[model samples]
Structure formats: structure tokens, C-alpha cells
Target chain A: MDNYQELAIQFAAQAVDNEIEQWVREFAYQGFDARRVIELLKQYGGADWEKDAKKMIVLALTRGNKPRRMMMKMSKEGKATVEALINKYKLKEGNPSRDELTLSRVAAALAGRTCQALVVLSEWLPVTGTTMDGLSPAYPRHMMHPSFAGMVDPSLPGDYLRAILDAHSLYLLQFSRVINPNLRGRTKEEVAATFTQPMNAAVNSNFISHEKRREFLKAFGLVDSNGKPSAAVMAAAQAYKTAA
Target chain B: MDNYQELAIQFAAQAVRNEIEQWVREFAYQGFDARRVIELLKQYGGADWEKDAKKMIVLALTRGNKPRRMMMKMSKEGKATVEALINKYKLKEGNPSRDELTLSRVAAALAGRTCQALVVLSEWLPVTGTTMDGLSPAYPRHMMHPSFAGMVDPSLPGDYLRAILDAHSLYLLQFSRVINPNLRGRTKEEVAATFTQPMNAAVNSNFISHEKRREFLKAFGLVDSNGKPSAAVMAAAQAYKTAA
Candidate 1:
């Protein structure tokens, strides 16, 4: 009996691996990449990512930090670029406040330095009232990339947001496969199982409470009063639209 | 009748403008922006863009240029950054050829100089044999963005490529609007008209020869023996999935 169970698990794992390969091919057919999409999500997604990111931002903006001691961290060339921006803007502050200096301005000033821009936007901006929305107000390209979704709302549980992001990522994966003939293989049930397994694990592990789960579901109209799928659930399930 | 015709033109123009606005909003539903997308396309796309870019790159690489006189264009501090990149790469070229040095490497060397990277990639790289594909080998993020599609094939007519890119941009715009409840409008006809107009303009124009048109269409299986839309045309329309 134990041997049979192990055999079944092996078969399932093989099937999933095949499905992932197929999905990657299908995504390629549509000019999007499955692996890169997944990588981008993993790089930027989750509550822990946001928590740590906020801490970095606080440090960058703190008084007597590198932006003040900007010369030390950067190469001489980078320091010159930052110094030029500092001169151009005439933005003088011994210790800059979030209110006094916009993080966007600081990012723009550090525009010549890609690494410095990362430091400002990833490290300094998180501490300000500036959310991902403010950082990318013109194009939210950063926000649209799936990884930035978790930072949009800190009120929600990290695991829950990650699950949703992962689900959306799965939706993209399966949607690409479904649309292209070369990528078609997995049954809808199989696809559902692949996505729901992680989601279910998160829910069952008490990462999200029953009341919160129901509230979130009801808010999206995903579930009915009896915890059954709503009328729109089937259609909405295929939709990968994000509100971030 | 004249009044009615003028009113119709006004109505159509207003509708297109509104559609553009909604597309921008819808793209932002997922944290992306349409205008910025258009800007990225404009920044990256076209023969005119490339033609002008090559000149700038040639200037940068020429003898007695700022890269040679590297200290002139940058600050005193910035010279150290460039000097460090120079030393690290051992790039001692007084004059560099497009083949001898990949623009990607040049961009890397000027890592601290974000402004210079753009000048290198846009101005310098375009002049080289290195296409966007060569530049983004690991992940074609540039190609994945709807804007960069037209720039992929320099052999194709610029206007034709631009038209297709525009059509795809419109598709992304409308599709975003259609999926999100907050941004839902434009009839099937209106949406279809918006895409087909630019496409039709390209097809009907004398920019590409009839033989060339037939060859391109036949390759994609878009047209039959007589150049009428094939049975596969509708499906193929949604699949501009360029290999580049």
C-alpha cells in the first residue's frame, strides 16, 4: 500500500512537471514568458518583501545616512552625478524629511545611477507616504509587474496577498496555454488543482482565518452565503486582472 | 447633410479620445499605464529613431570624444566612476567598432551613468548588428513590452511596423478595459474599427510592394491566393507573436 501511494505521488509530480513545460511553451507563443513572469513575482511579491523593503527605505532616508554621506558609498562618478543633481535642484537639507523632499525627486536626481535609483526607490521611498502608486504615478510599470502587488496593501495578510498574486500568475500561465494549440494539454481540473493546492495549503494552515477568508471572498463576490462558488466565480476565475 | 457629417466626425474623434483615456485607466488597474507604454514605444521604435541614434553612438565612440575626453561630459567625481569602469573592463579603446565592442558591454561599463546607458542602448546599440533580441537574450523584457514590437524587424517598412505596433497597443488598451468592470466600454465595432484602420492603412499603402505584401501575408497565412482574408485571418489577427 505504501509503495502504491509513492508510485501515485511520483506520477503526479511528473505530470505537473510536464504541464509546467507546456505552459512555458504556450506563454512563449504569445510573446510573454512564463518563467520570467514567475521570477518577477517571486522577486517582488509577499508581505515579508514589503516589511523588509520598508525598513530599507527608512534607513536610506534617515539623517546622517549615505545620501548625506553620499560621497562614500558611490564611485567618484556617481557622486558627481548625484552632486550635479543636488546642485541643479538646490535641494539642501542636512536631514531631508519625507514631507520636505519628494522621493520621486530624489529618484530623479539619482537617475544617472541605476543602482542609486534602486537604493532610493526600494530603500528610501517605502518609509514615505509614497506607496508603489506614487513611485510610478505616470506609468505604474513597476506596480503592474505582479511583484509589486504585495506592497500595495499592508492591511491584508502577507500570505493571502501572495496567494492571490500566485493565483493571478497561474491564471496568466493557463490562459496562455488555453489560447494556443501548441500549449494545450492539462484538463481544467488539473489546472485548478495546480493553482488551488498552494492556496488551499495557505488557508488550511490558518494563514488566513475563516472569517477573513469569507469576508475577502464576499468582497470579490467569489463565494455565496453557503460558501459555494458564486455565479460569476467560474468566469472571474479565468480573469487575471489586478487592482494594484 | 454637411452638418450631420461634421457631427459624425466630431463624435468619432470624441469616442477615440475617450477610448484612449479608458485604456490608460484600465492598464493602470493592473498598475501599468498606456501613455507611458506609448512613450516607451516612441522612445524605442522606428527607423527615424534608429537613424538618429546611430549618429550619436558614432560620435560617442569617435577619437577625441568625451569617452576619450571622458572627463568633459561628467563631473569631477563622475570621472572616477568612468575611470573605475575603464580599469575594471580594461577597455582601452581610443576608437571602438560596433563589432569589436557590444553596446551591451558599453552600457554595463557606464552602470553608474543611467543617462549614458540610454544613449548607449538607444543611440549606440541600434547602430550595431546587436538587435533588441541580442541585448535582451536572457529575457526579452524590451520585446515583451507591446511598444518594442515595431523595432524588432528593421527590414519591414517603418510605417507598417508602427501601424501594427499601434494596433497591438490598441488591443492591449481595449482588452484591459474589457476585463475590468471599472473600465468597460467601446462596442465590438468601435474596437474593431480602431484596430483595423491603422492595419488597413498599412496594407493599402504603396510603402510595401504587392509582392512583398502577398509574401508577408502568405507567410502568416493571413491572405489566400487572391489576397483576401483567409479563414485563419481572425485567429492570426490576435497572434502578432513575433519571434523577435
Candidate 2:
């Protein structure tokens, strides 16, 4: 499967699991058998959900893999839930050796609703936001540029690093093209250049950081001027992050 | 009958005695007594119709009215079908005189879909949006002051106007608040103000047209920045207008 589709499969599995668990906990009546539900979901939900999971992953993760933190943050005590989940899942700190199924099982353990099963799957193998941000460097040849792979070895020239950062920013703006219907080919090229231009310039000067990127996003009015992030930009970033 | 019910009864009588006679002569069906159906509807679709019609009116004349315009613009010219009922019975400009029997007959004539009925109602009488915008000068007493009409017109020149605008903004923000339980009172207040503050300022300046008011909606960035006038705002404004 393609990376997006692959992510969708994992996302659907995890969300289904998470939601099922939540459903059991919320309603004392034992109308739903967890095992049977899981089995039924695997056989049936898999058909449509994998496709929809991909769309949600596209929606949620557009920023980076860590968007799980954001998704949980949007629901319930969004911020607290994200922070807690990060700690409980060892999400940011550890890289587990197991395959996607293990993560799905864990997500099923975490769910409070049927829909949340997808959320868990998405949280783990996010194609977009936070998770994608964390994973990009590790799979340079796949999601990243070939030149970026050369950066991993740490012996690459400084000039090449600037070029890679430039390419990444341009790649990031590709997402803007999709959301804005007015974006023509040249306009998209302009948008990508707009993002990559200053971004790589900062990287060339060795000042790029999460803080700096946030500042760049803020300056672009990618975030609302009044301190709210542009939901459109956030969505775009999530899409880009997911693709990564 | 109550106010709206009384209106519907008047509307149904007007439609059957005046409008449908012309329709029957023009399109005679195989075995249908269109007149009898109209009579039955006039008799049976009674006082209950006022409440139900009002609900439907809220959705159609206001909430879902655009669907007709949109569907018409997209459909082929002169395409005849049950769907054509929208264009066939559409109310003329200005609020037409209506009674309950006429209202029921008209709704039945349109097969219980009410574009024509609403069109007649709308033209024969004032619609919600116009009423609300036009209401400011006449009522002098603001309808939605958060203290729930308790806010005195404050006689403070702009204060009552501000309160009314704020109240409308609050209504819109309430949707978000319900959907997201995590929204704190302070945050909800901020959200309401974000949309209201600019609006009140615009109205006070008398600088913003309804068109601009709609365009400015992009700044609020809630409800997904739909790039159009808010549906809720439209509803509240019309509700205010209708009352006046």
C-alpha cells in the first residue's frame, strides 16, 4: 500500500480499537462484545474505514506525526489529553520495534468510542503534523529528498544543508496549493518559494528551530494575527506533515 | 390561531381560491382532482401547520433557501418535474396576504415543499434578514442583550447597539461552545467578542455594507472560514427582523 493508504489501515485499526474500549467503559450495558466487534470491524469496517482513515489522517496529521497531541487536544481537555497521551504512549520518547498491529492493539485499549479507534491509529502513524515531523528525517529516501538522506550521515557540506532545507519548505507549500482553489501553477510556485525562501535563509544562518518555524508561521499570517493559528494553514501543515 | 398560525390560515385561502384555479386549467392531470386535494389540505393541515410551517419556514425561507437558488442555477432551463415545484409556486416579491387555509393549500400544492409558499410569504411580508437590519431604528429596545433583554438601551448611544450585536455574536459562538465542552467561559467570551467587536464597530461606523459584513466573516475564522455570511447570523437577524 502507499504510505497514505498504509497509514489509513493503521489508523482505522487503532481508532476502531480505541472507540470500542471507550464504548464499553461509557455504557454499562453489555450489548457489544469487544472481541466480536473487533472481529466484525476488521472484516467490515476495514473496507470503508481504511479509505476514510486516510482522509482523517490527511486532516489531522497534515502538520506532523505529533498531531496526535493536537487531535486529543481538540477533544475533551485537548491540551491535557494530548500531554497525557504523549506520556502514556511514550509517543515522543521511544521508538518501538513492533509492527503496526501492536500499535493498533494498544489504541483499541485506549479508545472510548468507535470513531476514536481511527484517532488512535492516526495518532501513532500520522501522515501529517507532529508524527510526520518526527519521522521525516529517518526515512529521507522515501519522504525526504535524496540529498536530505546525505545529511543524516553528518558529513554533508553546509551548502547542501541549505539546499535541503529550501527543498523541504517548498515541499511544505505544495500543501497550500491543494486547499486554495485560486492557486494556479505559478501561484503555487510562488507560495512554495515564499515558505522556502525565508525558511532556508534562516537555516543557512543556523537559526532554524521550532520557535523560529512558529515565528515564520506567525509572520505569514499562517496563524491569525490575533494569536489564533490559521485553521486553513494548520490544516495545510497537517496535510504536508501527513504526506511526509 | 396564534400570530403565525393566523397568517397561515389566511395564506391557504388565498392560494386555493386564487392561484390553483389557474394552475389546474393549464395542466390537467389524468385522474386527479387537484381541487379536492387542495380542499383536504386546507381542512386537515390546520393549527399544527402554523408551528410546523414556521419550523419549515425557518429552514427554507432562511436556513435552506439557498439550496433552491443553487439547484435552479445548476439545473437545465425549463426542466419539468416534481423538482420544478420550487420555481412553479415561488412566492412573488413582497409579503403576500396569507391565512392558515391558504398556507396549507399552498404547501400541499407544492407537495409540502414550500419555496413557492415561502416566496409568496416572503414577498407578501417581510423576511427575517431585512426585518432584523431594518429593526434597529424602530424597536429602539434591543432584543438580545445577554442579560437577556434586561440590558437597558443604556441610552449610552452605541451601548444598546453593541449589546444587540454582542448578543448575536454570542448566539453564533454558542454553537462552538456546545460542540466543544472544553471551551472555558473566558475562551467562549473571547470567541464571541472576536466576531462581535468588529461587527459592532462596522455597524457604528455605518461603513460596512451587508456584503462587507459577509466578507468580514472570514476574519472570525470559526465554522471553518466558509468565506460567506454566517448561517446562524442570518437566522438570528431574520428572527429579529420577523419579530419586528
Candidate 3:
């Protein structure tokens, strides 16, 4: 089967693609250069993605917790900078009952404490059924990939399956911060301690693995004679490889 | 008619509101002590806000900036114990770049740079706008609050106008940052600088110093008899007081 990590990659890929396309549209009018957008994405979008989309995939595969605004603070830091920027903007607390502060103020207070994780499907698999072509039930805890989480329906084609997988890969990247925490901010030792690289290797290997490849193609009702799709499917699936 | 100072407050308000909201959403499900939320906002979100949101009409009205993340990092930060709770969760970056560094790493790289402001805006404003109203404007340097700036019609009611004005306040908070670099991180100074508080005095003065109010309302199609609206509108307008 495609396994959980592959599914996470798929979702991240899809998110990245959508965000990038949206970015292009919004900036298409302004002289905001595409390269800058790409650079920014590479810079803050996720970690170590060779391409914008793959970066998201990497986040999806390795993330372990949900994200929060304070985590964003460490990166974007709008709250601190803007606070220093002006005085008028109030960030006060309304202790209505000696306990409950103003909702807005409460929000601001939590901003700095946020660890901002980019969690993986272990958090989401409960909502999404983890199955491959409805054949094998998935272990939600172990399920890592969004696509492998059984987001794809039964009647889809192999090429379509691959395309969706690639699409989802980028999809998760754009919002990786919101979804997973592991991908947020980690020192090399910190990340390595979590075994992220190897864990993700397990995740990626499932998608491109020989057995999982055949199962994926057949699950989507595509040709899987040689244990994988034809040449064209591989070509189209290259988006997963090419995207960062 | 929205002069530099008023505009600055609005930008600062927008930024403050955005950050606060994101923080809330992150910890919404966790049932932490509301007092913690209040304390965090005070140190990181901004000044006297924990009290202001109560006495004031709107939370954004008294919104200012405080970088809790930095505060927690400072000496004697043990007072802000939220950091320990956050670390316990092992929260990490969600949307990391795939090629190199996570979002936090990128943030670390750009911490004190001009680009940091943009990153903050990119992260904060978007998150705030979307949290408050599903649709935050794309970029800070371009389109801002109101989500439809320069298109105020003047026929709106108090509550609707309140939201728009509310959004505009945040817009101004951020706007001032780009216009006046000195304003950056001056949450307390921004108010002292006569950027936000004076405007509040003007709006609530009842003495007709609301020339700025009339012009701004007129531009937004929010103007009406009774010389605008009530204390509520003026209260909503307070977001601009410390915007920048």
C-alpha cells in the first residue's frame, strides 16, 4: 500500500500548488517578482525543500504537532515588530470575570508562546479513513500521508491517482506550519533526535516502493502489469519529484 | 483625510488584532488558564491591554504590540511561564521550506532585517485577517484592511461599520510600520508619540475635533446624521489610537 507518509506528502503537495497558483494570480498584476515569491516560499514556507512544493511535502512527512501564531512570531514576528512600530495598536486584556480576559487580548497573549508545529496525518487520520483502495484498513497512528489516508475514492484512475498525489504534496506544504509542528523550527540535533530524516525516508519509500506502487495503481483502477504504471504516468508524476 | 498618525494607529491596530486572534486560535482547544492568556498579551501583545479590553469598547480599540516570544527569552522571564507549557508540547515549525531551514530558521535569519517586517506582515496580517474574516488581503505594501480599501460607501450601519473600521484599524497599525521604521517595536512609545492616543481623544472628544473622523467615515460610506454614530463607533474607532 501507499502507506501514511506518502499520503502526507500528497496533501502537502496539493496545498503548496494551490498556494503558489494563488500567489501567482495575486502578484500577476503587481510587479512583485515570481522569483521573490519562490525565494520567500523557500525561505519561510517549509524546510529544505528543493522546490517550493517539495518543501511542503517534507513538512507534511515529518511534522508531529499542530502549529500556533506564536510559532509564526519567531518567523514572521509581526506582533513584536508592529508593537515596536507603533503605539496606538492596543493589545490589552479584559478581565471580565477575574479570569476570562478579552478574547482578543487572550489571542495576543498566546501569540508568543506558540510553538507552531506542522503536524502530520497522525493528527488527521482519525477524520480521514486510512485505506488503500478499500482493501486494507490503515493504522491511523502510523498513517502519515494525506493521500494514503484514503482521501482518494475507489473509482479514480492510476494517472489521476499519481496526479492527485503530486498535487496533495504541494497542498500540505503551504500550510505546513498550521498542520504540523515538527517542521516548524528545529536545530539539526533537535530534528535529528526525532529521526525526521529516516522517518521521512520510510514515508517516501512507501510511495515509490515496488509493492506499494502496484497496489496504488490498481487501487485507482489503472494498469499495474509490471508492478507500476506506464512511462506516461511516471512522467506526469514527476511534479512530485521536481517540486521542492 | 486619515493623517499619518491616524493611519499609523490603524496599521498598528490591524497588526495587533491579527496577532492576538492567531494566538487564541492556537490554544483555543487547550483550556489553559485565561489569566495566562491575559498576562501573555500584556507582555507580548502590548501595553495595558489586559485592562483596556475591559474598560474599552473593543479589544482592537486598545490593541498594541508586545513580543511575548522575546519577552519569554528575556531575563526574569520566569514570570511568563507559558514558555514552559509550550516547550512541553515540543511544538515545532509547521510550514518549513523544503530546501533549507524551517520557517523559524528563516525568521531567525531575518530577525533584525527590513525583510523581517515583511515576513511578519506576511505571516501576521494574513493570519489575523483570515481568522477574523476568512479573507485577509494578499500583501501589506499593496492592499490592506477593509479588504476593500478606498471603497467605503458611507451607507453602512454601526455594527458593520464597526467591523470595517475595526479591520481598518489593524491596517493602519501595519501601515505605520513601513512608513516610520522608528515606530517598530515601540508599542509604548507609539502611543506616546501622539500617533494613536491623540486620535482616540479626537474621536471621543465630542467637541468636533473629529474632522478626521468625518472625512474617513465619508470616504467609507459610513457617515450619517448625529455626527457619525455613537460611543460604540468611536470605541471601535479607538483601534486606530495606537495603530502604528
Candidate 4:
């Protein structure tokens, strides 16, 4: 598997489809691994989830500058940077592989160096935001560009990474042309699709056409200035995907 | 285009995506072409639309035996009819054509004979209903089967033909895997996609999982005895695609 795809797979494998937005908010509260946070929270948390969740929450709050951490930052752009990622790692082009391969399986095939490269790629995703300052990659929706893989500042603290990956998971779920739910085999593409298919439905059924898509998305703050849905909407969408 | 596919295209060509279920009910009221019925009603109707609309309505309600006509019937089963349509047409298999082609274009290509063949096949779709008697083709959701195309009774009167085609339109709208919205070029697939993408949404989001799909669809009478969605649900959906 290609390194970018491995990171995408790893990122997606970590994301819970039904709870994507919830996971991100849970990441907002718990950081990094939302599922794992729930796991550890379950062991000693629960009614005290408020207490135990607060323990991890306090640890995270104490360590990082919380506001800046919520905002993942972008790194350099341009041809020089593209070559920089390639130049350092002798970056090999990775295949997107088959639609049938689950993201977990893609993680299994990665080497340690490739794993590092994937971590490098994950930081580049353009997470959407309420503040222009919170956005990353300078551009929007470039989750897994092939030739021009983007990057973020690795020095940007821990919470930023979780939010970035959460935002990337959101972006990829809604818009990836490569991943659709209809494949004959049950793949992670479908897992991702199961979450976002409702969004497409909201666009198609409750509010049809481009004009109405903007209007409906505007109600949810899902559309960008150009009226197209951006990954940035994820910043706004986190609390609501679980709204029932 | 293949006869069944052409009819699917023809039926789909007539369906208004934003208004398919409405169109079906309109077909129920107007008989034959709903859009055309709206057209003739537009000529001298309006404030008096009820008057002129009822002009044709009386003509229709008066002439045919309305109750029996609403119930389209199935003809003899098995190999004989398939060979019969083929034998009559010399049964050359028609192409599905490229996904880029519209149903209107498909209509243009059909020979007079192929037109007759499509008309013959249009009678065959499995339209669903409150009563088993309203259903045609004993099975459900077989909008356009390839190897063994289904058939309805030609002797089965006119109003029945309209409801049968409308249900066919609904069946095709809901279940055809052949037509997806994501194709590169614009096609009837997207036109069709614009309608049913919402049902998939209901199944994936508002009610997720097989059990829930059955439950949500059950609330709408969309599931079958075995709990899969059958085209029979069309009898119920006609009122709602417009409930905004």
C-alpha cells in the first residue's frame, strides 16, 4: 500500500463511522484515540466518566495550549516542498489498491518508515474551521493528493493531530471519488460511506439543487463562501452528527 | 437499447426526479402520462383547473371500469412469453448503451418494432400495493431483469398500464444497481439518482442496520414479508417524496 493511503487507512480505521462527529468531539474532550479513550473511560470511568474523562481531559488541558491545539497548522507549499518529502524519503508512489481492501488491512502492509511517512502525510489534511486560523494546508479538501501531498508542522502539539485526523476523516468520508459504498465487497469505503450517505441524502432530498444545497448547508454551516461543501464544515459538524 | 431497459428509460424519462412519487400519484389520478395530463389540464384549466381537469377525469372515470383497470394483471408465466416477444421481434438483444446516453436518445434509436417491444416490456414491472391484487408480476422489485424479462397482460386495460409503468418507474428508481449518480458524463442514471438517493439515506442514516432498515421501511410499508424492500412499497411512497 502507498504511504499516504496507509495513513488514510490508519486514520479511517481509527474513526468510528456512526460516531464520526461524536468521535471528533470526544477527541475534543478526550484527544487522539476517541475509541481508546472510551475504552479506558469504560474501565474506570462511566458514572465517573465525567471524573475519569476529566482526568485525561485535565492532563491534555494542562500539557497543551488548548486553543492553538484545536487549530492544526499547515506547513510549506510549492514544488520545493513536494520534492522535499520525496527527496528525504525517496518517496515511492503507492497504489490506492482495490476498493475491497479495508483500511485496517492497509495498515498491516505498511513498513515502519512508511508508517512515519503516513504520519507526515496525515498532518497535511485541510481541516475545516470556524476560525480561518484553525484551518490547515492553506487550501481546503486536499486530504490525500497523489503528486502534491501536503504537510503540517510536526511540532504542532498533540491535540492538533487528533483534530486534524478527525477533520481528515470527515473530509474523506464525504468527498472521496475513490471510495463509494456500492462495491460488491464490504470495504472501509462502505464504512465511510455509511456515515456520509446521509449527508448526500440531505442534499438530494430535503434540499435539492445547488441553490438549495447552499441554503440547507448554510443552516448547518456546511458550505464554504463559494457554496460548495468543504472539509472545514467538519469543524462545524462535530456536535450534530449525533443529534438524532 | 434493450427493450426492458428502453422501457425503464422511457418510464424514467417521464418521471420528474423532485416529484416522482407525486408523479406516480398523478398517474393514479390522470392515467397514462401525468405530465401530459397536466399539459392538457393547463390548456383550459386553472382556477377552473378543477373543471377542465375533471372534464378529462369524467371522460376517464365514465368510460372504463375504473376499479378493475387500476389493477394491472400478469399474463402466462415462463419461457413461452420470452420467446414470444423474441420470436415476434426476432429477439435480438439490445445494448444497455453507454451510461452517458439519455433515455430520450435511447428512444430515438429504437426501430418501430423495438418501440413495440419496449411497450410490451413496460407492462411487466413489479409495482407494489396495499392489496395483493394491485400488484402485477408475482415477484417484487424486478424493474428490468436481463436474461429473463418479465411481462404483464396486454389485455389488461389502459389505466392499469399507467399504474404498472409508474410502479415500474418506482422500482427502477429504488433498486437498479446499473444506474448510479457518480458517472463522469451526465446520464439518465443521475436523473434517476436524484430521486432514490434519499431512500438509501433513510436506510443508512435515519435507520441504520438490517433490522432498522426493516423497521423504518416498515413504518412506510417498504419492506416485504421476508423483510427486504420490495417495489410494493411504491404504493405507499407516492404521497411522501413531496412531504416537505
Candidate 1 chain B weakest lDDT stretch, 10 residues: B8-17
Give every candidate's TM-score on chain A.
Answer: 0.26, 0.27, 0.22, 0.22
Residue A38 displacement (Å), model 4: 46
How much lDDT does each candidate structure score?
0.31, 0.31, 0.30, 0.28
Once superposed on the true structure, which residue ranges of model 3 sit more than 4 Å away at CA? A1-148, A157-160, A169-238, A241-244, B1-129, B136-244
Model 1 DockQ class:
incorrect
Superposed model 2: Cα runs more than 4 Å off: A1-36, A43-244, B1-49, B61-63, B66-90, B93-161, B167-244
| TM-score of every candidate | 0.22, 0.21, 0.22, 0.17
State the TM-score for model 3: 0.22
Evaluated with DockQ, which candidate comes out highest? 1
| Docking quality level of the chain pair in candidate 2 | incorrect
User: Tens digits of per-residue lDDT for model 1 on A108-134?
Assistant: 222122222222232122122122213
Give lDDT tens digits, candidate 2, residues B1-244: 1232223222221111122122211111122232443444445545553444443342232222222322332213211321333333332221233322222233323322342232223212212212333333211111221111121122223533343444354333443343233443546555554444433332433222444433323333211233322344344445433331
